[PDB]
Amino acid sequence: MNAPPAFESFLLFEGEKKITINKDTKVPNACLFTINKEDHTLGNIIKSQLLKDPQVLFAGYKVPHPLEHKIIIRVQTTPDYSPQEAFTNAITDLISELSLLEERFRVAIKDKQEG
Amino acid sequence: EGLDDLENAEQKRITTPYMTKYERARVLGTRALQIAMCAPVMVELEGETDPLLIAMKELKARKIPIIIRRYLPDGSYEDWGVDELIISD
Amino acid sequence: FIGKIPIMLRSTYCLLNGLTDRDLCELNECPLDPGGYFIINGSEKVLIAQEKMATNTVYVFAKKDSKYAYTGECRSCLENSSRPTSTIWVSMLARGGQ
Amino acid sequence: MIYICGECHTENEIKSRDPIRCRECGYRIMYKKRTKRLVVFDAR
Amino acid sequence: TVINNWLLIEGHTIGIGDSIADSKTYQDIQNTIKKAKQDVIEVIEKAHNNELEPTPGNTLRQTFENQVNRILNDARDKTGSSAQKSLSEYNNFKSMVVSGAKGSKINISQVIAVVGQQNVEGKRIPFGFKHRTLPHFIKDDYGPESRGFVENSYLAGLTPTEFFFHAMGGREGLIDTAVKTAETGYIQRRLI
Amino acid sequence: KNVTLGVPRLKELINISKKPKTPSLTVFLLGQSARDAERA
Amino acid sequence: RDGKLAKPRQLHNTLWGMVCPAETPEGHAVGLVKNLALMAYISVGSQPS
Amino acid sequence: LSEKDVDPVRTTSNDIVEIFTVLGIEAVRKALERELYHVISFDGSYVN
Amino acid sequence: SLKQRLKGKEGRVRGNLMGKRVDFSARTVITPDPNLSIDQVGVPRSIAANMTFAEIVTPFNIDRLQELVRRGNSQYPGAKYIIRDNGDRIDLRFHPKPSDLHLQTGYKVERHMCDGDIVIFNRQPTLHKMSMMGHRVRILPWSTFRLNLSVTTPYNADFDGDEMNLHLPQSLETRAEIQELAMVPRMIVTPQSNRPVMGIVQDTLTAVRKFTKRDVFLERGEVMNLLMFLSTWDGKVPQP
Amino acid sequence: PYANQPTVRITELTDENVKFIIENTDLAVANSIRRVFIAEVPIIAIDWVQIDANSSVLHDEFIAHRLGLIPLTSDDIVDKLQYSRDCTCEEFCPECSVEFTLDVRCNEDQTRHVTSRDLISNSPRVIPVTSDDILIVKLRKGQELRLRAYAKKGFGKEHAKWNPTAGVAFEYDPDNALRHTVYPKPEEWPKSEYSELDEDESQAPYDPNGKPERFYYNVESCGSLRPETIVLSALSGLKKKLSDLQTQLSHEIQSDV
Amino acid sequence: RKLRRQMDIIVSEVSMIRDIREREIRIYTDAGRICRPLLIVEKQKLLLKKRHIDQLKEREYNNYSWQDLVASGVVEYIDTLEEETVMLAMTPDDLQEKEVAYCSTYTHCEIHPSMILGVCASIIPFPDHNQSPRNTYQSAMGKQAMGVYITNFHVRMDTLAHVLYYPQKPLVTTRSMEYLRFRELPAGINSIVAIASYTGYNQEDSVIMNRSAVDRGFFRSVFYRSYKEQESKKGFDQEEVFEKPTRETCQGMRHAIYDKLDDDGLIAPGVRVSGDDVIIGKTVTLPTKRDCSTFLRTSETGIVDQVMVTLNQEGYKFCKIRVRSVRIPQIGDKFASRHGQKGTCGIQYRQEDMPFTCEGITPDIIINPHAIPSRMTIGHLIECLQGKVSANKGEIGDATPFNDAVNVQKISNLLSDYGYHLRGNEVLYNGFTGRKITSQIFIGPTYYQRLKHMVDDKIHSRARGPIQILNRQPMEG
Amino acid sequence: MIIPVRCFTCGKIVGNKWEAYLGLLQAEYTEGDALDALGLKRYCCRRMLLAHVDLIEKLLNYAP
Ligand SMILES: [Mg+2]
Ligand SMILES: [Zn+2]
Ligand SMILES: [Zn+2]
Ligand SMILES: [Zn+2]
Helix, strand or coil: CCCCCHHHHCCCCCCCCCEEEEECCCCCCEEEEEEECCCHHHHHHHHHHHHCCCCEEEEEEECCCCCCCEEEEEEEECCCCCHHHHHHHHHHHHHHHHHHHHHHHHHHHHHHHHC | CHHHHHCCCCCCCCCCCECCHHHHHHHHHHHHHHHHCCCCCCCCCCCCCCHHHHHHHHHHHCCCCCEEEEECCCCCEEEEECCCCECCC | CCCCCCCECCCCCCCCCCCCHHHHHHCCCCCCCCCCCEEECCEEECCCCCCCCCCCCEEEECCCCCCEEEEEEEEECCCCCCCCCEEEEEEEECCCCC | CEEEECCCCCEEECCCCCCCCCCCCCCCCEEECCCCCCCEECCC | CHHHHHHHHHCCCCCHHHHCCCHHHHHHHHHHHHHHHHHHHHHHHHHHCCCCCCCCCCCHHHHHHHHHHHHHHHHHHHHHHHHHHHCCCCCHHHHHHHHCCCCCHHHHHHHHCCCEECEECCEECCCCECCECCCCCCCCCCCCCCCCEECCCCCCCCCHHHHHHHHHHHHHHHHHHHHHHHHHHHHHHHHC | CCCCCCHHHHHHHHCCCCCCCCCCEECCECCHHHCCCCCC | CHHHHCCCCCCCHHHCCCECCCCCCCCCCCCCCCCECCCCEECCCCCCC | CCCCCECCCCCEECCHHHHHHHCCHHHHHHHHHHHHHHHHHCCCCCCC | CHHHHHCCCCCHHHHHCCCCCCCCEEEEEEEECCCCCCCEEEEEHHHHHHCEEEEECCCCCHHHHHHHHHHCCCCCCCEEEEECCCCCEEECCCCCCCCCCCCCCCCEEEEECCCCCEEEEECCCCCCHHHEEEEEEEEECCCCEEECCCCHHHHCCCCCCCEEEEECCCCHHHHHHHHHHCEHHHHCEECCCCEECCCCCHHHHHHHHHHCCCCCCCCHHHHHHHHCCCCCCCCCCCCC | CCCCCCEEEEEEECCCEEEEEEECCCHHHHHHHHHHHHHCCEEEEEEEEEEEEECCCCCHHHHHHHHHHCCECCCCHHHHCCCCCCCCCCCCCCCCEEEEEEEEECCCCCCEEEEHHHCEECCCCCCECCCCCCEEEEECCCCEEEEEEEEEEEECCCCHHHCCEEEEEEECCCCCCCCCCCCCCHHHCCCCCCCCCCCCCCCCCCCCCCCCCCEEEEEEECCCCCHHHHHHHHHHHHHHHHHHHHHHHHHHHHHHC | CHHHHHCCCCCCCCEEEEEHHHCEEEEECCCCCEEEEEEEEECCEECCCHHHHHHHHCCCCCCCCHHHHHHCCCEEEEECCHHHHCCEECCCCCCCCCCCCCCCCCCEECCCHHHHCCCCHHHCCCHHHCCHHHHHHHHHHHHHECECCCHHHHCCCCCEEEEECCCECCCEECCCHHHHCCCCCCCCEEEEEEECCCCCCCCCCCEEEEHHHHHCCCCCEEEEEEEEEEECCCCCCCCEEECCCCCCCCCCCCCCCCCCECCCCEECCCCEECCCCEEECEEEECCCEEECCEECCCCCCEEEEEEEEEECCCCCEEEEEEEEEEECCCCCCEEECCCCCEEEEEEEECCCCCCECCCCCCCCEEECCCHHHHHCCHHHHHHHHHHHHHHHHCCCEECCCCCCCCCHHHHHHHHHHCCCCCCCEECCECCCCCCECCCCEEEEEEEEEEECCCHHHHCEEECCCCECCCCCCECCC | CCCCCECCCCCCECCCCHHHHHHHHHCCCCHHHHHHHCCCCCHHHHHHHHCECCCHHHHCCCCC
């Protein structure tokens, strides 16, 4: 009766935005990135990529409730760097790493199959 | 339960100037109902829609137009304006 | 004809008595079913064993609240007959009376 | 209106007026035939 | 919220490893229990020889039981404290007992060292059989094992007689729980 | 020795009846009996 | 009336091997309801003749 | 309380009915509180 | 007879006056939820859609209430009934045509229970004040009620199958009365013993013992993760 | 400040599982990768069933449940098959689903074992992995099971039937050089198959400067996808999710600025 | 005694009690005396010999049975009265040993000390390793668990019946289970249980379940509810009959659809039903005819499994409709560990969210560690340990109480040979971040039971519902 | 009733190994040796077949 549809864990409903950015009034150069229909898979990977950036003063993520399908990522950067730039850079870095990882995995399969 | 019960076989105000928690509860609830009934708001509200939150703002501003008639055990009473009592919060 | 006696399933008078596991399955009955119950209006009724004091045996007791210091009772019942049990109490009156 | 005899598992047609008794076996326990409507089950 | 997320990194558990104790600890426990039995046997011998004098305001039976009960209680306390002291900082039973979240010092000792004496109505196991606690003992056996002293721990597992005596002692807790649960509300609905 | 305590004692305090379960006194001594067991 | 004289809820020593020591319901029925041990048998009775 | 060498000040009884007829309603008020406090404090619990 | 209706536990006074059945109440099994605040209760969507709160139509909520009216019973959150100034009740599920459902100040809309609604949550036996505390509703997608672990102490609750009673105040007077008198934060300390009636328990109590040990060190990535759950954090990372 | 330079070394590659090592990678990337193997790798599995007749001892929705758990050959077709929600069709059709049919009638004294071999699909690309055969309900003489089902694209995040992995072993720092786990008595713990410690050694010396690297994986496949296909589909799937997020994130930034 | 042991003139159930100190001999032949069989011991030696055991092994095709032991005088029934006079050896291996010399006049010996347990108590593994109140609580849970109540459950039409989809025999059994037929009719599933404080959702006796396991049918069950109705012509003015109400047939009818009903007024099997649907259409002639149809409850949602029509004991037309509802494990469902640890499902985490071992094994259920120290259910820990060896060794572990051949140390030694920590601990990895957990989690196969208490069977709500017209107070609709 | 299709813990196919397992037992293989021959390395998969009770074999003893 109350069980939610299994697809709601990853499909956005009508009028739901994938990501919404809210500036953190507590500290300058801080923003809260709320991503809908995502979990630790994207939250944890992005958090680590942000932490690797020296211009990111703070990077962390949390799930408001495990029954809900939202992740809030808080990012704080130095006064000369904007969190939206760090977030976009972090995502491009992950896309680059995974792209290189795909190519190297394909080569490894061929090498293992050939010899 | 019976076996164990028997075990037979086996001016001129004397009240405090502070607003009580009960007075605050009823004052806020009553004023909130009035606000929800389109009663004019005695405080300038901005971006507020909940009549109960509006009543709390009026209480902090001491603008609620309500008087508490405190009944004494001897049958006498004291009328204390909300603006006259000290708010416990 | 004098009436009908409810039969305990799998008893010596039950139809499912002595039947092999295959015969029980053919009758749509579980071979593992222990039986020991009665079907009354389609409902499986089980008779819970009732615990009570043994008959025809002398028991000596003492009651602090009663006037008797000690009392020897015997719940006499005839041999497999005359179900109404008659109890005789032989009681010793207390010494503390004034 | 088809019913299946609980003993001989034979399909028989029965009206409101005639008794439940099986046409050939005489058994008085009949089971309604499964509905012809389409029932969808999600494989979850 | 903060600590429950940190607990995902640190983690918390409870298992057989926490119930285990060093062989030295088991030997100390066994030696303590052996000493307690010998002490109880000496008290029994003194009573049988009429060499035991009743304490003021108490009869011989009360005096005898008081001496026997304190010996068994001291043995449980000694075995329990010895086990508790031998536990490592990593022992999860200690972590919960030290924090006070759940369990207690007595639980650790009952699980690891000695469950102890079982009581019915605040006294040792009664002679439900005339002169006997169970048909396995001799008549007039006032010894610890006879009257319900469980020398084994829940890890070691109770013997057949200890198991029935622990079920007798635990039945009183089930009855008292049912009584307290029923008659506690009564006192309040009357006071009000 | 035993004394009524807990829930049944609380029950007696609210149910003040003519006959308690464990009526008793706590007697104190003034002179030497307070300090001498024999006099006590 | 009989059960008022002595409390039958306690696990009596004589239940060894006759009745299960652990198997009893919680609440008002503790120790009032019992279950036979696996090998426990109840006498069927016969003529004393 | 009338006996010689027995402390007439501290000697008391746990029977509230005796305190009422021997000492009075005010003694009961204090005695009831002391008995009520003892049963509550016996296990270490506390009530205001 | 007439006298027979008055006597007994089921009689008029004892069975129909001193205690009686009440509307706007629900009961189901309670389950833990460490993510909800102590003053917050997770409620099943089915219960929230079944229970209603009568909101008076005001110019501050006229637009919001008109939306909930057109959503109706089929879509949650919505409303069950509209009460006009004449006091007549209209069921929204019967005729959802907006032309006939236009609202005006003074009307009452029985909207479904939603997030932030004040409710009285109780566990029986009700032995003291802390057995009935005010909570804020939080809609969760399952049939159980969710309770913070801290409040299990005053309720003497354990998630071994226990059920609890939820009551929804039907007017602003009672709603404000609960907010100002019976909410869980006000019940933290009990006058019975001059001490807090609820404390940290179980996992959080064993973990805080470990977490507070002198030799527990947290790396930058670990600290920044924990600080996300600290709602009271001022946003400044302390010097390690 | 930028992306890592991951490297891959495959240790085993069979039709059942693929064992490989990933080096110079962050634990979050390594973990998210294994999470995608379980919840984000799409496969084709039965999700809709119409049972015309079922005389077996198992109820209709129980038969449907067993059919859903049956893995179906979907190595190449899953890439081109659309989700029913995304396809422009009205209902189930070859562009978004594959039809399955089963019709078994028993008339012999010998019990008829309905297996995955009895499932006939309209597309040769999507067929049961076994076509021993997966056991389905057993029919007595005169019993029958007649049904038609539709298999559609989905991933393990929606339902475990769409998970292509039969177990994903994941390990890092087998010698516990990072001391991420503290053993009370290291001598009591057995050595990991990936460990490089001597017989007398119990743990590697603590490395305060160390960080998780050289992740060991063993991806076992149920059969729906080849083990190497799972990793490739996952890596590309994880990249797609991040690329989609970057796109929506860019529009959000562009709308606010 | 000789005549009783020979069964010449005295039957085995007759008890002879001699009160030596009172010069009294009581012979009881009446019914209702509780008794149990005990092996006879003479001259500190058992009368039971290997020849009897060999004949008992060759039980089939030989007709040798228990009755031959009684007739041989090897075993006899001792009642509660005679036990007073009986000196009973707990075991021949140690109680009657001349080296102990505790007693030199044993008259009988226990066959196996574990036979003092009942039916539900014999299902507990290692009960001698559990606190006594937990063995009592498990005895109740064992009666409330789910499994297969009877083999012919498909033919039976019980008012309430819960059948588990995949019941399993316990990996750690008690010898008595062979006699209780718990192997043929199991009531539970062996679950990979991890004892860890995983995100706090298992606190206060709560349980966390693997959503991927539940999706695979873990603890999934089918609930059968049978509805019975008959048509009776009692009172010539009233005549009730099964038939679908029609606008012309009934003067007044609700807008509810009756199309689910057939021309006979009965719903057909395979049709989905809910509180809005009618399962039986019955109408009674008024003194036009009114309808007295049988509606399901709002909580009732399922499919009509079977519909039978018969003539009952009264000879009236009678029918039973069995509605099938599948209960998939969900938050709030109660579970039991077979050791008195009863708990509701707090949350369900998918396979990638649950913590995993180096082998990729994720626990099916995660329980709070604080449940064990207060309850002292060490038998649960030992069962979890014995079950891990059992699954690896490929043998059903024996957890019969009072057995000296099985102990924690021997189980730990065996587990060490299978490449696992001797105390059952494992290095678990956090599913969310992949980092190793600092503490090693105790995990292993433990037999769990699903109780009949489902959240959907207890959830209820009331908001301005039907009230009594006389009392004007709330009532169920 | 019948062998699970997927192993509850890890999802490995075991629904095709029951008749193979019974065949191994009939060939005098021990329960452990039979599980090893089938390749059930993880104890969670072994638990599936070792603890399974194929009650459908008994349910098939009743007429349809
Ligand atoms: Mg509870
Ligand atoms: Zn027929
Ligand atoms: Zn389509
Ligand atoms: Zn597995």
